[PDB]
Design a binder for this molecule. Structure first.
Ligand SMILES: *[C@@H]1O[C@H](CO)[C@@H](O[C@@H]2O[C@H](CO)[C@@H](O)[C@H](O)[C@H]2NC(C)=O)[C@H](O)[C@H]1NC(C)=O
Ligand SMILES: O=S(=O)([O-])O[C@@H]([C@H](O)[C@@H](O)[C@@H](O)CO)[C@H](O)C[S@+]1C[C@@H](O)[C@H](O)[C@H]1CO
Ligand SMILES: *[C@@H]1O[C@H](CO)[C@@H](O)[C@H](O)[C@H]1NC(C)=O
Length: 863
């Protein structure tokens, strides 16, 4: 037994031969660091009893427990395996207790499979019976993708474990954590997953959300696969250099999906087809957002808003944190410090901006006839609180307002209550979107104001290595009771259920609009409802660097609108760090500068009306806004097809092994390469330039670099931005708000490849109506350039923007001088446009043209 393949039999304590012998495992203390001294033997677990049975969907097998001493308690004697060949690219298998119903995640999107095994499978499944293992191989090359035979199946009531070999070390995903790098360290690493309010720092703890998905790039051909575990109990995932991964959970069932794709993008698409593709955001949510904890007063907030508006900062959204509230209570505002809040909301709206308000789940229980607190009275009337273990008394904890009860968003009636609270509050403050926070759920006491009873839920036989080592730390008692079940089973689902309930509330408060929901805690599928931010980071260079893997991983998870707090939540931010973070932050799919309580101001204009930081911030935000039609179309593809938005280099450049661990650069979609300076004092960045033609975004000059590491010169006012040859990028003249920018002239940037060809697309709808994609009210056009000729081709034409939008500029990169430029409309000539040519840079710009959005054109030229 090769030491890299040993599966640890003593995860719970310092390894001893005595414990090893008792557990019937193998003892060998002579390995390298982290190699398990005690590891499972060749036959520990389950065997198949009798024959497999064909079903319409796949097959079932009965697994029988081989005799073994009970380590983490009540072992499951008869296990049922149910396997379903759900699609050509997705396999589903579950291990359940044959004679008892167990908790299964009540997911809102995923449904039970009815139907027949798919035809033309890209995979094969192989079951070994003595001892049990399950293998999933790729049919084309027989590559073993999933293979549980490396370790036992373990299945006790509060301890379930299965391992899989992996075909490579290119492993990406799992969450929510700060991994620091994007490609996984496979060198004996354990990642705990249990929704927790904790600082995203260098300690590798469980954080706000629970994401069990990972993607593996098998080799340079691009062939990739993914694995998702549908389980919401506390768990940890163990990575080792075999390479192999082990999932270790403390309840529910092992419900696994395996996805195959021809590229990393296709694996993500397969995962999202299962779990739910992300919502198409409101176009305004793609703009820049500004926020802080404790402006203190509306006057102070209003002063910040005004100096950034005075600076002409692209600036769509203002967030109001708990300081707007009357003593930190939801659905109120402070009538003294925030007197005139409704007038301020009108000011934002008149300026073409949006208000996003924070709402916390926990509700103050302080109410009397003397001073009623409406949300609590109404919630108690409807009996929609999380209860203590007696099943009848609302659990009391403590959050921002003091003592609180917690809504049980798993109860359908709770969404009715929540909806009414928002309707009532929206009648006072006409906010545009909702930021749901502290929804792990976060509790300032451990469990409840009276602690937690000692029992198998609060104190289980095995505890994954979660921060502080107790499940109820800074959250609710594990024996608290909700509609879907006990907190032990549904804790990781709280913020998911809250986001589902908040989207329901939006149906009434914002009829037929998308609005915007931003959530802290997530589960698999949360992106269908909400954006995410990476939580309470710190103003350090480490946090700046660590942000990029976090953004890429949430894109894998189908929450593409993701970003950190730009400049750093905790601590005063250094000018240089904030300047670099604003440059990079202009390109986070969710772009928000947010700051903690009491720290020095870090809004862009606070650095000086004429400062390098403000100038550069404005410059790069103006570039972001210019590329919004491109970014929005990327979101359209995430929503409709399941593509990533912020995308790892390796998803486009998988043939090139130098991209497999790149985490200091990323792409927008296939075509825009972003190269930030991430090191203090630096005016350079060591960067990778992939195997494509690349053009400097601002000058349009073709770089000489290709497929190579470079030292990119990036002075204090620059971030690297390069356009990929072969792509056509739709643009729109920027303005300080997207309300205004969407009325502006459009442009095309044609970045020619080595063959002088390029292709692109543009999605365009009204930017805010819900279901425009499902109801087919949108424009989708395709651009292609193949020598001497641009074609604009319309594939869907069921929305026509009333603002007379047209492409009034075409910039062609990598071209010899165009002559005789001719424009045809539906094949019919043809006015001569203006052409400007830079012969040193090989850039042509065509102007004095008006190609109406939604019409077919051909633009032809000679050389
Ligand atoms: C939490 O406890 C409350 C009682 O405090 C339960 O309320 C019941 O709710 C239903 C309406 O759905 C009513 O038919 C019952 O009359 C209520 N019971 C009482 C005693 O008033 C509530 O069901 C509990 N929640 C959970 C998840 O168990
Ligand atoms: O006092 S804090 O440190 O700021 O509290 C944070 C943690 O709960 C934890 O660090 C401490 O409670 C334990 O020391 C909490 O997450 C802040 S919330 C999310 C943020 O984005 C909003 O601006 C804040 C107000 O709504
Ligand atoms: C930009 O927006 C302002 C409103 O903030 C508007 O007055 C102005 O005309 C817009 N500029 C255009 C049309 O580019």
């Amino acid at each position: 037994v090769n030491e890299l393949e040993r599966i640890n039999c003593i995860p719970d304590q310092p390894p001893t031969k005595a414990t090893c012998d008792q557990r019937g495992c193998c003892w060998n203390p002579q390995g390298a660091v982290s190699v398990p001294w005690c590891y499972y033997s060749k036959n520990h677990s389950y065997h198949v009893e009798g024959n497999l049975v064909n079903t319409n969907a796949g097959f079932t097998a009965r697994l029988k427990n081989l005799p073994s001493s009970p380590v983490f308690g009540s072992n499951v004697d008869n296990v049922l395996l149910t396997a379903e060949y759900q699609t050509s690219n997705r396999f589903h298998f579950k291990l359940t207790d044959q004679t008892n119903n167990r908790f299964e995640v009540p997911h809102e999107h995923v449904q039970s499979f009815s139907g027949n095994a798919a035809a033309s499978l890209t995979y094969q499944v192989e079951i070994s019976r003595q001892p049990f293992s399950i293998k999933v191989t790729r049919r084309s090359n027989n590559r073993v993708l999933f293979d549980s035979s490396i370790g036992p199946l373990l299945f006790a009531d509060q301890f379930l474990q299965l391992s899989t070999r992996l075909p490579s070390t290119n492993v990406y995903g799992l969450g929510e954590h700060v991994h620091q790098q994007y490609r996984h360290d496979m060198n004996w690493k354990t990642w705990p997953i249990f929704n927790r309010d904790t600082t995203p720092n260098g300690n590798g703890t469980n954080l706000y959300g629970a994401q069990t998905f990972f993607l593996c790039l098998e080799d340079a051909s691009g062939l990739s696969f993914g694995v998702f575990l549908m389980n919401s109990n506390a768990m940890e995932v163990v990575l080792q250099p075999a390479p192999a991964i082990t999932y270790r959970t403390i309840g529910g069932i092992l419900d696994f999906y395996v996805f195959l794709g021809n590229t990393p993008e296709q694996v993500v698409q397969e995962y999202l087809e299962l779990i739910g593709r992300p919502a198409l955001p409101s176009y305004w949510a793609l703009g820049f957002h500004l926020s802080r904890y404790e402006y203190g007063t509306l006057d102070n907030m209003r002063e910040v808003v005004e100096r950034n508006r005075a600076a002409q900062l692209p600036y769509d959204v203002q967030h109001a944190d708990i300081d707007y509230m009357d003593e930190r209570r939801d659905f109120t505002y402070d009538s003294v410090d925030f007197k005139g809040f409704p007038e301020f909301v009108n000011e934002l709206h008149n300026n073409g901006q949006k208000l996003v308000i924070i709402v916390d789940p926990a509700i103050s229980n302080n109410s009397s006839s003397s001073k009623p607190y409406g949300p609590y009275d109404r919630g108690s009337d409807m009996k929609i609180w999380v209860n203590s273990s007696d099943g009848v008394t609302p659990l009391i904890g403590e959050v921002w307002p003091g003592q609180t009860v917690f809504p049980d968003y798993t109860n359908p009636n709770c969404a009715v209550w929540w909806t009414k609270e928002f309707e009532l509050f929206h009648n006072q403050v006409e906010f545009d979107g909702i930021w749901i926070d502290m929804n792990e759920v976060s509790n300032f006491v451990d469990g409840s104001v009276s602690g937690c009873s000692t029992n198998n839920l609060n104190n289980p036989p095995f505890t994954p290595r979660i921060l502080d080592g107790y499940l109820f730390c800074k959250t609710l008692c594990m024996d608290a009771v909700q509609h879907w079940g006990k907190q032990y089973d549904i804790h990781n689902l709280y913020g998911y259920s809250m986001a589902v309930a908040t989207a329901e509330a939006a149906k009434t408060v914002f009829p037929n609009k998308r609005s915007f929901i931003l959530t802290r805690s997530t589960f698999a599928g949360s992106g269908k409802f909400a954006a995410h931010w990476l939580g309470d980071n710190t103003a350090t260079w480490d946090d700046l660097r660590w942000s990029i893997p976090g953004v890429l991983e949430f894109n894998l998870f189908g929450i593409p609108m993701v970003g950190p707090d730009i400049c750093g939540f905790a601590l005063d931010t250094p000018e240089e760090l904030c300047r670099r973070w604003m440059q990079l932050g202009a390109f986070y799919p969710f772009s928000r500068n947010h700051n903690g309580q009491g720290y020095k101001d870090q809004d862009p204009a606070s650095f000086g009306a004429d400062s390098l930081l403000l100038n550069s911030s404005r410059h790069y935000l103006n570039i972001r806004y210019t590329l919004l039609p491109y970014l929005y179309t990327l979101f359209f593809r995430a929503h409709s097809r399941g593509d990533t938005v912020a995308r790892p280099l390796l998803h486009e450049f998988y043939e090139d092994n130098s991209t497999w661990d790149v985490h200091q650069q990323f792409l927008w979609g296939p075509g825009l390469l972003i190269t930030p300076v991430l090191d203090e004092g630096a005016e350079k960045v060591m960067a990778y330039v992939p195997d494509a033609v690349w053009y400097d975004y601002e000058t349009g000059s073709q770089v000489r670099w290709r497929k190579q590491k470079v030292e990119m010169e990036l002075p204090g006012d620059k971030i690297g931005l390069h356009l990929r040859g072969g792509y056509i990028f739709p643009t729109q003249q920027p303005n300080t708000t997207t309300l205004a920018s969407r009325k502006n002239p459009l442009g095309l940037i044609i970045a020619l490849d080595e063959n002088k060809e390029a292709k692109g697309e543009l999605f365009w709808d009204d930017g805010e109506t819900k279901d425009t994609v499902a109801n087919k009210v949108y424009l989708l056009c395709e651009f292609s350039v193949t020598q001497n000729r641009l074609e604009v081709n319309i594939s869907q034409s069921t929305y026509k923007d009333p603002n007379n939008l047209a492409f009034n500029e075409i910039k062609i990169l990598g071209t010899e001088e165009p002559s005789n430029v001719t424009v045809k409309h539906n094949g019919v000539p043809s006015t001569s446009p203006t052409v400007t040519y830079d012969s040193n840079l090989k850039v042509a710009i065509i102007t004095d043209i008006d190609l109406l959005l939604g019409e077919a054109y051909t633009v032809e030229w000679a050389h």
